[PDB]
Design a protein around this ligand. Structure first.
Ligand SMILES: CCCCCCCCCCCCCCCC(=O)OC[C@H](COP(=O)(O)O[C@@H]1[C@@H](O)[C@H](O)[C@@H](O)[C@H](O)[C@@H]1O)OC(=O)CCCCCCCCCCCCCCC
Ligand SMILES: CCCCCCCCCCCCCCCC(=O)OC[C@H](COP(=O)(O)O[C@@H]1[C@@H](O)[C@H](O)[C@@H](O)[C@H](O)[C@@H]1O)OC(=O)CCCCCCCCCCCCCCC
Lengths: 540, 185, 541, 185
């Protein structure tokens, strides 16, 4: 009762201890997971995190500490979401992203609004027919559910379906849509949650018109804030030639400040830190040192893996909470049907529309991995548990259905997308001349200059080299760059593993959990050297 | 509108396709020479990345000449139009189209045949195999590939992949799809 | 009143926004600071952070948001302190630290207990004489103040006094004491804060005996937890040859888990994460890839510089708070005198005791930089604002005196230690033969093998190479290491100044907490090693 | 106790200092030969780091011999004992001590004089300057340093740094402090 020499005090170190245990156990499970290529080529890593979150939630339930864990909006929206989005936006291949900006936008904004509106309205129409039965629910609740339920993550299944089907435009669609619909879903989530605050009778026609105007203003203002802060981040790294240690700190602090500045102006915070990473990419990591750029990209997978791990551990903690488990036969089995049917015909319709104005069509196999690439994961789940439990009467049913859909998509669709794609796409001279045909086409598609946004790429490169590089790149770097530009201005299965791959078939990967540098860019540099050695034959 | 009409008959394009490709041509004509040279094609950023890019560029120009005008651009660029079945099923007059399957096959062939001999020797095939296979491979394996290729294709006894043998060995490959392009309007 | 298209919502993004602004503004001020060597060689960077914290606190006071900022114990002790201590312990030169373990311990444990006890008791004796006057204060409050006030940071002034006096043993004393007395101060802080909870009458003799026992149990148990977790961290990186991306995550998560495990067992959490970094150093960064080891050490200066920045921003905010300002003439001007006099004679006495059993004496110039190396800063200040405002009646006076002492030490002593040392230590053949004499001595001091803990270094190296490396290093790494050991076993005026090799004793080691400072004199070691090995090939063996 | 007494008289150490240095010697004697060789010294981890380490090791051994026993170890190791003033002010008999200032000077000298000529030529000084100056320096600068050193020290005309000139040029340096060691007890 006096002075205690030592006191076991677990309640003290209990939040940080459990969070750090989550991250550590996920990292150990990643040690086990990536051990064998026979696993990482079959199981999406999101499935590992979801199963591990289930197991750790089972431990939490055994310890009877379910009520100790709550995901709060100020934590997800300020600390758990920014790292994920910044990681996605900082590893975005800029040339592919901007050469396919319209396609990504159509799959990510119209595709999300299509999925959200159709799922919400179809569930509401089912509800009006009495199939669900005696749910105290309204139209805005259904639209909120549909909006959060459109937060697909098809890039989570990228590393596994690209064992059997590689297409670098489909990669950027999957990766762009994964990232830009987090923004669009959160925009729709905020709009319909503001509507839920007002109520199904307080929302007038002008309120809905302001909702539409808010969608566009929020999205575009967030993008603009992100571009401004990417300019500022590119600029500040210009002046860190001497103090090179603070450069990784700048990339994360200024991206975070873009996120919070948009969240301060009520703009799209996700789009701000998305484009603070997409746009800072060229000049950051040109001004940053080599040693300080590995820190920036090891820390981005460090922050995003940890953030996604925490949300997936919370998914497990809720997936074992027996007080949120509300199972409505119709609701669950029609959410599964609607989000899958409407995703399929949404992709089919958008791909048909895009293919009318494309030089390389999106073949039905590309549309298949988009339709089967629901993979609803962290963002989707988090947006459901962050719902207001009293403003949305049937929130527990939403959480249960979202957990069920997260598991169904990530585990059933995430695991069977590789067998399915490999099923749907089912001799030496044949292969050699086929590769020659592919290389001819990627030259004709290139000569005609209708693949990228070539006119705007040319216009940007002129503006980048003459104006932007003068303010965002160091003087000596400008001199070296112009010297380099001046000196370059004068200028059966064995066979399969030997041939060059066509530019269209580079195996790009984004993992959020490991660094996956495109190992086919080595081909580009090898051939460039071979042609330049051939360009020295003229002796010019 | 007449100028965009001789090109339409000779090639098969549409007026808007020809207009867009002409805009691309005059953009490619940095120097404004009314025509286009080897280095104007070489100036394209990602043709130097193409393993077969130089053969493509050379194929754009006629043998002997060292320049191409817009009509030649369109002629060598029209082999990559897709064929529509209902078109050839409607007015059957002749196998003229520059985008016919044999014409795409002949384009790739003339890439293989740097001599334009109409026959691909072992040396020509080995040269193109070298040009389009990673440097790490041993030239012994590459020669094995070349001679096995000729042997499995030259079902004649001449040890040469001549043109008729090319089509026969490619009878299984969908040339019509993997060398066809939706040129924009 | 309906649906708003856009709403300016600053109260929402207000804590993270201001914290990120703090870090960003400090980083920009570091861009300015390190621009000219004429500044970084004169001003300790801690002084930059303190002045910048003052300026940003002036902005906060202008905006009238002083009451919005509070440093809470769960934030300092769980998020702000671990990065600083882990950074210090992970860049500790292990050979110097362990070859001088006893000297560092004497300067860091006895030196802290001496400083704490003497300052606390001297302030209490002054208070009993009525000079301070009408302070509602007791003995335990004074001892708590003395304990927190012994949290010196002499490594903060290292980069500037080593422009004029380099000595790699004094570097490890300054760097070891900076790090190990954070532990000892926090141990004393916790002990005397538990006593303050009980009160000046509830503390009995057995309570004080348990206090002493708690000091030792806490310190040693924290060290042991740290060693266990450094074993675990070294072990887990053995298995990350394939998944190399999670290695920097392991170094920080497992070090943090050691910190919290000691904080869970009520042990010294600082000593746990100190020794989780000191001990993991060899095998971590042997198993980690080169690319993943730069992340570990760029992120450690990233987390430590940010945490110290954030504590110094709180110092600035508290320094402009006009409701915490309590100025007792006697208390302030005697805290300044006592912490300076007792530090001076504490170093003089300890150095005299150590010099009785040393092969290289600590010259009076070394004792000078230790005595003038108070530089009380982040830890000292934070421990004061974390005091219980009602259990310690005169807490505002403690905070005011600690702020005044932080400023006096860091700005006055931190800036005038370079002129002072350079004042106190105030021809071609002279210099050449002097360097030859130095090189002869560092060989005789080496041959006789009384400098390091050579017997224990030998014993450890035997145990490390035969047993520990078998479990903490990868098999192929063990095979490569033994092959390398086998192939090396067969081979068992101012211009002149800038040209000569420097003696091993005079390597310019630096630790900054704000920048990476690799010892650039280790290049000399490798150059000479190659020259002698090329001379060892002359035998053709 | 007699064995630790002849060493005490010859060198000047204490019994405990001799005992500790004997323990260090027998630890250095991996191989247990009763004596100690060049490679036993070379086996010390941070003598190979010393720019002058090899000269030190050679100085430990007598000229001609290739081994040293404990008595020789202590003889060559006693030059680095400090001198106490009250000791030499008490019993003034002779300048015998192996730790006298001239003896430390002579030790460093014999390092410079690899020939043991008693005089340092330009070649010997240049050799030691090379051995203890970074490789980046030009040998022209190094020769300038060597010859300037001899010229500023050899106040005689022989272009050699002979021993008496060494002491004269070092008359300003506290040899007594920067080459003295508190050997532990
Ligand atoms: C069936 C869908 C329902 C009707 C559409 C709904 C409103 C969308 C407005 C027009 C949609 C289609 C735009 C016109 C056709 C089109 O695709 O040319 C294509 C453009 C641009 O496509 P790209 O930039 O990829 O260029 C490629 C190609 O040119 C080629 O050269 C290469 O093959 C490739 O390599 C290049 O990259 O695509 C785009 O511009 C896409 C525009 C992005 C829209 C942003 C969202 C704003 C819409 C309103 C939001 C509310 C939701 C509505 C409710 C459902
Ligand atoms: C005037 C001081 C007041 C009295 C001391 C208080 C109790 C401390 C116990 C003994 C202190 C002195 C230890 C014996 C003498 C000593 O220094 O040999 C030295 C030892 C070890 O020193 P080193 O390891 O550095 O070896 C060097 C050398 O041998 C040499 O070879 C090389 O020159 C060098 O290069 C090597 O490194 O030093 C040590 O062991 C230091 C021990 C560390 C103490 C830990 C703290 C526990 C004490 C109680 C805590 C409560 C506080 C008390 C109230 C004030």
């Amino acid at each position: 009762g006096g002075f205690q020499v030592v006191t076991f005090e677990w309640a003290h170190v209990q939040d940080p201890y459990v969070i750090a245990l989550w991250i550590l156990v996920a990292s150990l499970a990643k040690i086990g997971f990536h051990l064998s290529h026979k696993v990482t080529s079959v199981v999406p890593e999101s499935a590992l995190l979801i199963v591990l979150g289930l197991v750790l939630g089972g431990i939490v339930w055994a310890a009877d500490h379910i009520a100790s864990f709550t995901l709060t909006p100020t934590v997800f929206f300020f600390y758990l979401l920014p790292p994920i989005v910044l990681d996605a936006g900082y590893f975005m291949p800029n040339r592919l992203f901007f050469g396919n900006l319209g396609t990504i936008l159509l799959y990510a904004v119209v595709g999300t609004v299509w999925n959200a509106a159709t799922t919400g309205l179809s569930l509401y129409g089912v509800f009006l027919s009495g199939l669900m039965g005696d749910l105290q629910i309204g139209l805005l609740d259904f639209l909120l559910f549909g909006s959060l339920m459109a937060a697909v993550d098809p890039v989570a299944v990228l590393a596994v379906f690209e064992e059997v089907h590689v297409n670098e435009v489909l990669f950027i669609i999957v990766f762009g849509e994964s990232l830009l619909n987090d923004a669009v879903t959160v925009v729709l989530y905020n709009v319909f949650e503001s509507f839920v605050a007002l109520g199904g009778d307080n929302v007038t026609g002008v309120d809905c018109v302001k909702g539409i105007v808010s969608f566009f203003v929020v999205s575009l203002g967030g993008t603009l804030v992100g571009v401004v802060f990417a300019f500022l981040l590119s600029l500040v790294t210009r002046f860190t030639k001497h103090v090179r240690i603070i450069e990784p700190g700048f990339v994360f602090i200024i991206s975070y400040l873009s996120y919070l500045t948009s969240e301060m102006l009520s703009l799209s915070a996700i789009l701000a830190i998305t484009f603070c990473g997409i746009c800072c990419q060229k000049y950051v990591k040109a001004n940053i040192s080599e040693q300080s750029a590995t820190t920036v990209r090891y820390t981005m997978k460090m922050l995003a893996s940890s953030a996604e791990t925490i949300i997936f551990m919370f998914l497990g903690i809720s997936a074992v909470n027996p007080f949120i488990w509300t199972w409505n036969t119709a609701f669950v089995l029609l959410t599964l049907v609607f989000i899958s049917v409407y995703r399929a015909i949404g992709v089919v319709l958008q791909t048909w529309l895009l293919n009318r104005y494309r030089m390389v069509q999106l073949e039905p196999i590309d549309q298949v991995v988009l339709s089967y690439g629901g993979l609803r994961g962290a963002v989707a789940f988090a947006l459901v548990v962050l719902l207001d439990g009293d403003k949305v009467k049937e929130k527990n049913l939403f959480v249960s259905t979202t957990i069920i859909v997260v598991f169904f998509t990530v585990i059933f669709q995430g695991l069977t997308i590789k067998p399915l794609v490999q099923w749907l796409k089912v001799r030496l001279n044949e292969k050699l001349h086929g590769r020659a045909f592919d290389h001819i086409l990627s030259a004709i598609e290139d000569i005609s200059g209708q693949i990228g946004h070539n006119y705007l790429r040319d216009k940007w490169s002129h503006f980048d080299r003459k104006f932007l590089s003068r303010v965002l790149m160091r003087r000596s770097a400008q001199k070296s760059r112009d010297r380099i530009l001046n000196v370059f201005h004068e200028l059966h299965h064995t066979l399969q593993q030997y041939l060059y791959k066509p530019r269209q078939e580079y195996k790009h990967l984004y993992s959020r959990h490991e660094l996956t540098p495109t190992e086919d860019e080595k081909q580009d540099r090898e051939i460039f050297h071979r042609t330049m050695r051939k360009r020295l034959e003229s002796f010019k | 509108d007449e100028e965009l009409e001789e090109i339409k008959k000779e090639t098969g394009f549409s007026h808007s396709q020809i207009t867009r490709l002409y805009s691309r041509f005059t953009s490619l004509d940095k120097g404004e020479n009314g025509t286009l040279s080897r280095e104007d094609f070489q100036r394209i950023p990602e043709l130097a990345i193409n393993p077969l890019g130089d053969r493509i560029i050379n194929a754009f120009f006629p043998e002997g000449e060292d320049q191409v005008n817009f009509r030649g651009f369109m002629r060598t660029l029209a082999h990559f139009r897709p064929i529509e079945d209902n078109e050839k099923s409607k007015d059957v007059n002749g196998p003229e189209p520059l985008n016919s399957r044999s014409n795409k096959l002949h384009f790739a062939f003339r890439l293989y045949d740097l001599d334009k001999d109409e026959k691909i020797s072992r040396d020509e095939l080995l040269q193109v195999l070298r040009m389009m296979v990673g440097v790490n491979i041993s030239d012994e394996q590459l020669g094995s590939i070349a001679d096995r290729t000729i042997q499995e294709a030259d079902q004649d006894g001449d040890s040469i992949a001549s043109f008729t043998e090319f089509v026969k060995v490619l009878e299984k490959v969908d040339v019509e799809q993997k060398m066809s392009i939706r040129f924009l309007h």
